[PDB]
């Protein structure tokens, strides 16, 4: 079925699954985080509270045991999916922290991209900062590398940047996007990384020990920007088979890794789609849009 | 009819062999980029 | 039995034609490498 | 419309109740006495088990030049010629099918050995590229 | 056992010789007695019904009764005439059309089975193409890894 979900008062910016594929988390302008059950009637059990600013990015851990959520109010937050309660308020960010990423399968460690001009590394236990690479400017998305030893970030200056956690210098800078990059997501290959950018083009890259020195691999057309400049986010499928993107055009764009063909431009929405979520188990799609509700498409 | 029975028997036999042939190299590419992850790592150590 | 055999024979014969050309490709590949 | 033994167009067709197939009564009656079972399905069948069927009867137009003379001489001669030269030619056809069977199975098993020989050849050539 | 018909669009004389070289390596009663003797000897059994020629007092009297039976046997045919013939001609047209309906029913189910096979051939032939292309990529990757590993060893 289409299964449209509602109950959010303002835009929903972020929607993602339990890494179980059991529960649903969505969040946006309303400054709180709603949860649902993916199966049955797609019903709502819990609501997490506390974040004073807009929830700009929610992120799971790789088991699903604690929840990370970047807020507009200069703070990140980690909470207990067990309870929904705050364990840590990552303060210290000197501006709008938009992006958050918990280290997967490494020591518990977090990279946060913010509007201060720094990327910040934090340990959850110490209540203190680890490292911080002030390049010059706002960083809009951040993701680790599966070694938990490089950190990738995308901002306003269009050159995707990667730092080595040990030498702490600009390890890898990649170029070719015509305007600001808005989204990074590294496939479960640990290798292929996906980049949305409102210049209307999406790109694919690969962080390896050895890469061709110019690793701009695949390129797809279709995404849109407009006077909104909303933050646009992408994802790989669980399999690295289909790329899903949203855009300010009300069209859910589903493409393939293989033939780069347009498998879908699906209508159904009313406002810009900000985030598409793939089920880690199923062919289930969840769209978070600025029309103050969500969609549950089955393909 | 029997040609279908000979085909539909050995259609997965033609499939399941090639899956292993993919998987055998697919197993190697991990251990390839395991060693390729290694040989980049000690390269900086010799660089330092 | 004659018909099912002759069909399946020339069918099984095409297995060899395919197999022979792949076997051949493995030789020059490995040889030149 | 035909009999399922001789290839006749029966004068008194009778159907068996174990396997729905119409036979001419004389020919099915003979089979049951030889060995009491249905000829096609090899199921238990007796003379009382049969069921006679009725139809609008079959008509043959006896030729215009029909007398005791051609029916005794020319027509009856042709019938035992046509029976003789057909079954002899049919025995010739059965003999070649068994010979052409042997050329089929030998050429088949000859192909099996090629495949088995090439199955060891190919994968080891592919393996050598991997090595 | 496996030999793809739909996929294999492309040596037969060569492979036939190699298969040939592996092949170089590897109830009636009395009726049947007189019938086989008649065919072997090439002689049909003579029927004597001196009916035609005509001892000849009998042969003459035979010709009369059969000629009277003949002329009575031609009377009952001409009475009906062509009506009895064309009534059987109609039956033969009902008998014929039934066979060609079965020719169609067999034609449809024969093409229907081949139709299902075609999709299977095209399904897997793609998957084999994915493997082989993938296999080639894997081989290239291994070569690259070997070159890079050697460089690391050289340091």
Curated annotation (Swiss-Prot), chain A:
Signal peptide: none annotated. It comes from the Eukaryota. WD repeats lie at residues 7-46, 50-89, 92-132, 134-173, 176-215, 226-265, 268-299. GO terms for cellular component: catalytic step 2 spliceosome; cytosol; nuclear speck; nucleoplasm; nucleus; sno(s)RNA-containing ribonucleoprotein complex; U2-type catalytic step 2 spliceosome; U4/U6 x U5 tri-snRNP complex. GO terms for biological process: mRNA splicing, via spliceosome; RNA processing; RNA splicing; RNA splicing, via transesterification reactions. The keyword Cell membrane does not apply. Keywords: Isopeptide bond, Methylation, mRNA processing, mRNA splicing, Nucleus, Repeat, Spliceosome, Ubl conjugation, WD repeat. It is found in: Nucleus. This is U5 small nuclear ribonucleoprotein 40 kDa protein.
UniProtKB/Swiss-Prot annotation, chain C:
The modification N6-acetyllysine is found at residue 21. Ubiquitous. Weakly expressed in senescent cells of different tissue origins. Highly expressed in tumor cell lines. Induction: By gamma irradiation and chemical mutagens but not by UV irradiation. It is found in: Nucleus; Nucleus, Nucleoplasm; Cytoplasm, Cytoskeleton, Spindle; Cytoplasm. It comes from the Eukaryota. The 7 WD repeats are necessary and sufficient to support interaction with the RPA complex. Belongs to the WD repeat PRP19 family. Homotetramer. Component of activated, catalytic and post-catalytic spliceosomes. Component of the Prp19 complex/PRP19C/Nineteen complex/NTC and related complexes described as PRP19-CDC5L splicing complex and PSO4 complex. A homotetramer of PRPF19, CDC5L, PLRG1 and BCAS2 constitute the core of those complexes. The interaction with CDC5L, PLRG1 and BCAS2 is direct within this core complex. At least three less stably associated proteins CTNNBL1, CWC15 and HSPA8 are found in the Prp19 complex. This is Pre-mRNA-processing factor 19. It comes from Homo sapiens (Human).
Swiss-Prot record, chain D:
Transmembrane segments: none annotated. Ubiquitous. Weakly expressed in senescent cells of different tissue origins. Highly expressed in tumor cell lines. The keyword Cytoplasm applies. The modification N6-acetyllysine is found at residue 120. Homotetramer. Component of activated, catalytic and post-catalytic spliceosomes. Component of the Prp19 complex/PRP19C/Nineteen complex/NTC and related complexes described as PRP19-CDC5L splicing complex and PSO4 complex. A homotetramer of PRPF19, CDC5L, PLRG1 and BCAS2 constitute the core of those complexes. The interaction with CDC5L, PLRG1 and BCAS2 is direct within this core complex. At least three less stably associated proteins CTNNBL1, CWC15 and HSPA8 are found in the Prp19 complex. The keyword Zinc does not apply. This is Pre-mRNA-processing factor 19. Ubiquitin-protein ligase which is a core component of several complexes mainly involved pre-mRNA splicing and DNA repair. Required for pre-mRNA splicing as component of the spliceosome. Core component of the PRP19C/Prp19 complex/NTC/Nineteen complex which is part of the spliceosome and participates in its assembly, its remodeling and is required for its activity. During assembly of the spliceosome, mediates 'Lys-63'-linked polyubiquitination of the U4 spliceosomal protein PRPF3. GO terms for cellular component: catalytic step 2 spliceosome; cytoplasm; lipid droplet; membrane; nuclear speck; nucleoplasm; nucleus; Prp19 complex.
Swiss-Prot record, chain E:
GO terms for biological process: alternative mRNA splicing, via spliceosome; mRNA splicing, via spliceosome; oocyte development; ovarian follicle development; protein catabolic process; RNA splicing; RNA splicing, via transesterification reactions; spindle assembly. GO terms for cellular component: catalytic step 2 spliceosome; centrosome; nuclear speck; nucleolus; nucleoplasm; nucleus; Prp19 complex; spliceosomal complex. It is found in: Nucleus; Nucleus, Nucleolus. It holds the Pfam family BCAS2. Keywords: Acetylation, Coiled coil, mRNA processing, mRNA splicing, Nucleus, Phosphoprotein, Spliceosome. Residues 88-155 form a coiled coil. Ubiquitously expressed. Changing residue 89 to S: In a colorectal cancer sample; somatic mutation. InterPro entries: SPF27. Component of the pre-catalytic and catalytic spliceosome complexes. Component of the postcatalytic spliceosome P complex. Component of the PRP19-CDC5L splicing complex composed of a core complex comprising a homotetramer of PRPF19, CDC5L, PLRG1 and BCAS2, and at least three less stably associated proteins CTNNBL1, CWC15 and HSPA8. Interacts directly in the complex with PRPF19, CDC5L and PLRG1. Belongs to the SPF27 family. This is Pre-mRNA-splicing factor SPF27. It comes from Homo sapiens. The gene is BCAS2.
